[PDB]
Symmetry: C7
Subunit: 82 residues, 7 copies
């Protein structure tokens, strides 16, 4: 599963030591990014595989595979990295 | 059926080995791409014919032909390729 | 009837051999196109007179003339050509 | 009455020989056009006085003058010229 | 009362000879205009003091001063000049 | 209290001699302004400390301090200076 | 916790000496900023760690950690620094 431009695939108290009154997870896959409006180049994402991130699930598309639960979410949903 | 600029024609548990609690399908046709705002060049899509993709059916335009079910959906709908 | 910049005049199971659960039709007229944002040039449409196209009728303006039914739709509405 | 940048003043089955299930009318006045976002130049409108056009009445501002009924509508509303 | 960039101060059948089924009035003050997005220069308004204009009252901010009723309305509201 | 880029801090019949059927007030603090979309420079605001201004309270964020009632509103809200 | 591009992590009458009829707090972390639309560079934020700011909680994402309450809110939410 290769997220298309812009999306990132995230593998779904929190195991990090944080209480969330917004899930936490590990970036497993990342895409190319949104091309410039000019199409000259693509803007890169500031998250990379293995990054443990905090995101919201809005617009998320959950999909399960061999025991793991994955989420294909847009980069706009990743709020922070711990 | 030749999708016009930006649209891709997709042919509609999953045969890939994935559980989708969003459909999966095969990219059958692809268009030119949205022109730059400047009209200089068109932005290329990151899916090609034969690609097996995961997309959402929103705004989709289903059309049946000789027993097959097709969907003309915008590129913004394709989330990932497996 | 001359579609102003960007619009295209379309003449309204399908005679093509396609089942549409989106209408199909024949492009009878086409406009100049959206000027670039800078106003330098116009972007051209990828459809021309006689093309048989598949489109959605959203925002369409139906108008009848000498027994034929016509639709002035924006280029954003034409999804494919057969 | 001089339509300010972008608007055109239109003078309101149709007298042209068309059935509209969108009114038809004669372009009586036209404005300069929208300035470039950069304000370098203004974008010209593809309609001129005397043009007989088909448009929609949305956001239109009807005003009556010496027995004639006029409409100050934005350029975006003129769909085609006959 | 000096309209800040873009706004124009207008002083509120019509005395001009027009019937409005959109009020008419006299431009009493005009502002600098919107800066370009680049900030290089401001885009000028096409109304000047003394201009008698037709506008809509949407988003207007009526204020009364020494018996006169005034309106601070955005230039986007002034439709034409008579 | 220093209004961040673009906001201005205003200090809340009117004492100017105007009737407002929109409050009037004094500009106590002003921010740097919105960076160009390019980030090259920031766009300056056309009001300055001491300016007595007429604005709308929409989106305003009222805060009191030592008996005085203040408002942090975006420049888009300041309509004119008297 | 590292706010991704544009967000800033804030640490939640007010201890400053202000009455808020909008919370106040201390900027604990700051993100790179939004890339330019062109992606050339990122626009910098006008708040830095330690800044005590006044913001609104809209769209905020509250998260507690070792007894402290934090908020990951977008820069658009920071209204002023005291």
């Amino acid at each position: 599963i290769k997220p298309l431009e812009d999306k990132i695939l995230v593998q779904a108290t929190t195991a990090s030591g944080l209480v969330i009154p917004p899930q936490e997870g590990t970036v497993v896959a990342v895409g190319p990014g949104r091309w410039d409006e000019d199409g000259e180049k693509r803007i890169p994402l500031d998250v990379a595989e293995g990054d443990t991130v905090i995101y919201s699930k809005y617009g998320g598309t959950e999909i399960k595979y061999n025991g793991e639960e994955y989420l294909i979410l847009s980069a706009r949903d990743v709020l922070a990295v711990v």
